Design a protein around this ligand. Structure first.
Ligand SMILES: *[C@@H]1O[C@H](CO[C@@H]2O[C@@H](C)[C@@H](O)[C@@H](O)[C@@H]2O)[C@@H](O[C@@H]2O[C@H](CO)[C@@H](O[C@@H]3O[C@H](CO[C@H]4O[C@H](CO)[C@@H](O)[C@H](O)[C@@H]4O[C@@H]4O[C@H](CO)[C@@H](O[C@@H]5O[C@H](CO)[C@H](O)[C@H](O)[C@H]5O)[C@H](O)[C@H]4NC(C)=O)[C@@H](O)[C@H](O[C@H]4O[C@H](CO)[C@@H](O)[C@H](O)[C@@H]4O[C@@H]4O[C@H](CO)[C@@H](O)[C@H](O)[C@H]4NC(C)=O)[C@@H]3O)[C@H](O)[C@H]2NC(C)=O)[C@H](O)[C@H]1NC(C)=O
Ligand SMILES: *[C@@H]1O[C@H](CO[C@@H]2O[C@@H](C)[C@@H](O)[C@@H](O)[C@@H]2O)[C@@H](O[C@@H]2O[C@H](CO)[C@@H](O[C@@H]3O[C@H](CO[C@H]4O[C@H](CO)[C@@H](O)[C@H](O)[C@@H]4O[C@@H]4O[C@H](CO)[C@@H](O[C@@H]5O[C@H](CO)[C@H](O)[C@H](O)[C@H]5O)[C@H](O)[C@H]4NC(C)=O)[C@@H](O)[C@H](O[C@H]4O[C@H](CO)[C@@H](O)[C@H](O)[C@@H]4O[C@@H]4O[C@H](CO)[C@@H](O)[C@H](O)[C@H]4NC(C)=O)[C@@H]3O)[C@H](O)[C@H]2NC(C)=O)[C@H](O)[C@H]1NC(C)=O
Lengths: 214, 216
């Protein structure tokens, strides 16, 4: 597919996954994505800075050919958990020949007092017990920033059949969301215990669990 | 299919659907709004053609171009649509012509395709643990609806209760959508026993409207 352009290409910069910054064990990554990379000029150069200090541990993924006859070059910067949580600024400077001037883009965590999420499990409506599957609701509210991970389990095994809304801005400038775990109605009435797990900066050990059962 | 060639020196087109509530209530007026921005001073003249299922229509209302502070014009055309045409999945095409374009820009919009699915509406009282706080969360779960166009509201004694927030529709595993709406009320107003109603407006409901009540 022919679709050339000229500045040159666009840069997009993405933060780490909430979960990855909140557990020491995980590897949080800031990601600099370059699109609209031409063929006459498909080599890409990356500079990375942490609070204006250059760092060199960036890894560049191999080019991936796009439907519209452009290239997509991605550079991945592993970050220190506490750096990201302490609000350090990450700069991705992109040099390509189609750019007279380097493109600089900067991201950091949302600013301001972290706020503890309140976690409340809600059993199915009596009206839903007619169906063969029921809705186990986890309300998470009062949290800031919006960065959060929600998970579900029973007998310390991950429940797979859940969906979680994105965070929504509340009137107080806090965030809330809802996570819906869908189970066979029998499992509910049989009285199996279900856990809603929430990971967030403003929790002790960055973790809480509210249990739910008949 | 490959996309039509775009250019920066030329204008841009944005085409906006009716509001969900506007198509579901015969008393309201649903509209499709075609907005052209970045119209150059040197080519200010804008031509709109409108098509319903590729059949040109003539009843659209076009407003005088109005200058922005960045020294480009923004031009708007409004097509009133018949409620039953939108809900019967008709395709609304805006065609925009300008000397700064190699060819006219075409944009299309319609209700998302597929068999409508009735929303199930379930009210959930505040958690035991939330009763220690001064304000409590009245929860309205709406699941199994298609398409994602829906309106949700709250009320008590037939008076709108406005201290609520509603999640976007979320794609569910069965290809249907769900959302939650959170109404926030003083714990007092819940404990005295006042009655709160969660209202859902959707295509696949009888008369496009249901209500599920909630109280102590
Ligand atoms: C040529 O084609 C390519 C691609 O074509 C594609 O394939 C074909 C078949 C089609 O299907 C086509 O539609 C496809 O896209 C075109 O490339 C695109 O270029 C545009 C820019 O023009 C990019 O648009 C931006 O998208 C941003 C979000 O992108 C993510 O989400 C989408 C899904 O919706 C994905 O497609 C992307 O890949 C991104 O996905 C994310 O990628 C991250 C990096 O890996 C992931 O995070 C990482 O995840 C990994 C593992 O997954 C690790 O955990 C890492 O730790 C972690 O970092 C992330 O999970 C993943 N997320 C998701 C959601 O999946 C938008 O942010 C951005 O919006 C801004 O900019 C727009 C203007 O350009 C503007 O209109 C918007 O309003 C918004 O503007 C901003 O608004 C904010 C306020 O919110 C302001 O603060 C900002 O200042 C403001 N910015 C600006 C600039 O004004 C863009 O919309 C598009 O993503 C990109 N696609 C890809 C794949 O790269 C190319 O354009 C074509 N060329 C031409 C000329 O046509
Ligand atoms: C010069 O200025 C002009 C004008 O700006 C103004 O003046 C300047 C000086 C400033 O003061 C500025 O603050 C002023 O606003 C600039 O014009 C802008 O151009 C940009 C594009 O460059 C437009 O950006 C798009 O915005 C869309 C959202 O638009 C609405 O929402 C914003 C607020 O978020 C409003 O400000 C807009 O006015 C729009 O508002 C809507 O208006 C509708 C029409 O009236 C309303 O609907 C109707 O409402 C009535 C009642 O009111 C009835 O209900 C009718 O029934 C109903 O139809 C509606 O209420 C209202 N909405 C809201 C929420 O208020 C974005 O949608 C759009 O995004 C798409 O495209 C991007 C790429 O361009 C992409 O990144 C996005 O992801 C998204 O991509 C699309 O995704 C969709 C699905 O999501 C797909 O269909 C497509 O595949 C895909 N498209 C593409 C192209 O790939 C853009 O971000 C901006 O709207 C516009 N402003 C205005 C006011 O017109 C101009 O840029 C300046 N020029 C220069 C060079 O600087």
């Amino acid at each position: 597919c022919p679709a050339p352009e000229l500045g040159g290409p666009s840069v997009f910069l993405f933060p780490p996954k909430p979960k990855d910054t909140l557990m020491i064990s995980r590897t949080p990554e800031v990601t600099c994505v370059v699109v609209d990379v031409s063929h006459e000029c498909p080599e890409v150069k990356f500079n990375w800075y942490v609070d204006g200090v250059e760092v060199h541990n960036a890894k560049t993924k191999p080019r991936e050919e796009q439907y519209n006859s452009t290239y997509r070059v991605v550079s991945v910067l592993t970050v220190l958990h506490q750096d990201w949580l302490n609000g350090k600024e990450y700069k991705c400077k992109v040099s390509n020949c189609a750019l007279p001037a380097p493109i600089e883009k900067t991201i950091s965590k949302a600013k301001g007092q972290p706020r503890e999420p309140q976690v409340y499990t809600l059993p199915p409506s009596r009206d839903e017990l007619t169906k063969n599957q029921v809705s186990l609701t986890c309300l998470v509210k009062g949290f800031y920033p919006s960065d959060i991970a929600v998970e579900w389990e029973s007998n310390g095994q991950p429940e797979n059949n859940y969906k979680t809304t994105p965070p929504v801005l509340d009137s107080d400038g806090s965030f809330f969301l809802y996570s819906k775990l869908t189970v066979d109605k029998s499992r509910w009435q049989q009285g199996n215990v279900f856990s809603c797990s929430v990971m967030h900066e403003a929790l002790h050990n960055h973790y809480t669990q509210k249990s739910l059962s008949l």
